[PDB]
Design an enzyme around this catalytic site. Structure first.
Site, PDB file in Angstrom:
ATOM      1  N   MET F   1      12.202 -10.241   1.657  1.00  0.00           N
ATOM      2  CA  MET F   1      12.205  -9.360   0.695  1.00  0.00           C
ATOM      3  C   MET F   1      10.702  -9.952   0.079  1.00  0.00           C
ATOM      4  O   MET F   1      10.339 -10.526   0.077  1.00  0.00           O
ATOM      5  CB  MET F   1      13.201  -9.427  -0.354  1.00  0.00           C
ATOM      6  CG  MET F   1      14.520  -9.286   0.286  1.00  0.00           C
ATOM      7  SD  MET F   1      14.927  -7.407   0.788  1.00  0.00           S
ATOM      8  CE  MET F   1      15.522  -6.839  -0.846  1.00  0.00           C
ATOM      9  N   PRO F   2      10.236  -8.582  -1.021  1.00  0.00           N
ATOM     10  CA  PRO F   2      10.796  -7.253  -1.199  1.00  0.00           C
ATOM     11  C   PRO F   2      10.641  -6.425  -0.141  1.00  0.00           C
ATOM     12  O   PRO F   2       9.549  -6.617   0.688  1.00  0.00           O
ATOM     13  CB  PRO F   2      10.157  -6.796  -2.601  1.00  0.00           C
ATOM     14  CG  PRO F   2       9.177  -7.871  -2.966  1.00  0.00           C
ATOM     15  CD  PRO F   2       9.057  -8.890  -1.727  1.00  0.00           C
ATOM     16  N   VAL F   3      11.379  -5.173   0.033  1.00  0.00           N
ATOM     17  CA  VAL F   3      10.957  -4.097   0.723  1.00  0.00           C
ATOM     18  C   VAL F   3      10.683  -3.243  -0.067  1.00  0.00           C
ATOM     19  O   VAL F   3      11.143  -2.376  -0.979  1.00  0.00           O
ATOM     20  CB  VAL F   3      12.222  -3.885   1.800  1.00  0.00           C
ATOM     21  CG1 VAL F   3      11.953  -2.441   2.437  1.00  0.00           C
ATOM     22  CG2 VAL F   3      12.646  -5.014   2.377  1.00  0.00           C
TER      23      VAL F   3
END
Lengths: 58, 63, 62, 61, 58, 61
Positions: F1-3
């Site tokens: 993460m993040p995406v």
């Protein structure tokens, strides 16, 4: 408001413009958003990319 | 089809969400010549702290 | 890769959610030959007031 | 349930059909969803559209 | 540009404001979009909702 | 993460897309004090005929 619309390929540009106009109107009428804040993103998918009930639309 | 994800700043009433869902589904079905029962609408409520326009949060812009 | 966003009506249990993450990852890895360790699953819970089926909200039960 | 699946290009129709079928079943078996309620939307990305750790998949990330 | 940022839940409002400003600057720096057209949607996810390699973050 | 899923009106260069992947990933990692390697960016191009603002298409302008 931002609408992401997943729809099949095959609609002409005039139909996509009508859909954007009418979804925008539907949004203004139903929740009172100012029209200028309404964004519509059409995400066109080939039939091979659309799964309904485990079956591909192709 | 179609599937509509509707991203909204949090705060709308449940009745407003019903109206939006009805309106977008019926509009999409009519324009795209699709059955109404197949349409899907998913509303994502996003707090004004979590949405930005031009680098400013919706809260900072007064919602 | 791959990355999967799973949009669910609120209400599934934590163990159903863990089972879904597992089952969706193994499947994608298997079909695509993709390494398991790179597959991302993200669950977005939707309250029944926010989920429309055929023009009616899930809470209206349509 | 609605699944958006982000895939890199390079997988054929038959592989994509298997993915739609097998993800739908994995969803029916995991959360008890009635199968005609499982939507699977495949988003195919070119390598130039995929970033892994700040690097493009086109550069061979 | 419409950026949807999936991130774990629990960042405070100050960090979220910094992220929104900085990702917007990064978009303008990269592709030169009119800044007012850059919309950032943070999508916060509980750890039980994040799968990394078949394993939940929780 | 993040995406990060980044939806852009079609027409940017491959070089602009690579720059965007680099900048969003490094910026997320820097602001969140998170490892750069875990970040993911996915770009979706959308034609000007498929994007509306205020009920008008980007093509109509």
């Amino acid at each position: 408001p931002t609408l992401e619309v997943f729809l099949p390929a095959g609609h002409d540009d005039a139909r996509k413009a009508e859909l954007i106009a009418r979804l925008t109107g539907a949004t203004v009428d139903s929740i009172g958003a100012p029209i200028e804040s309404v964004r519509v993103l059409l995400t066109e998918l080939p039939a091979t990319h659309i799964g309904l009930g485990g079956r591909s639309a192709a | 089809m179609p599937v509509i994800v509707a991203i909204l700043i949090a705060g709308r009433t449940d009745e407003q969400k019903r109206a939006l869902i009805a309106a977008l589904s019926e509009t999409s079905a009519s324009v795209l010549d699709a059955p109404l029962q197949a349409t899907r609408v998913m509303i994502k409520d996003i707090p004004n702290t979590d949405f930005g326009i031009g680098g400013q949060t919706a809260r900072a812009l007064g919602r």
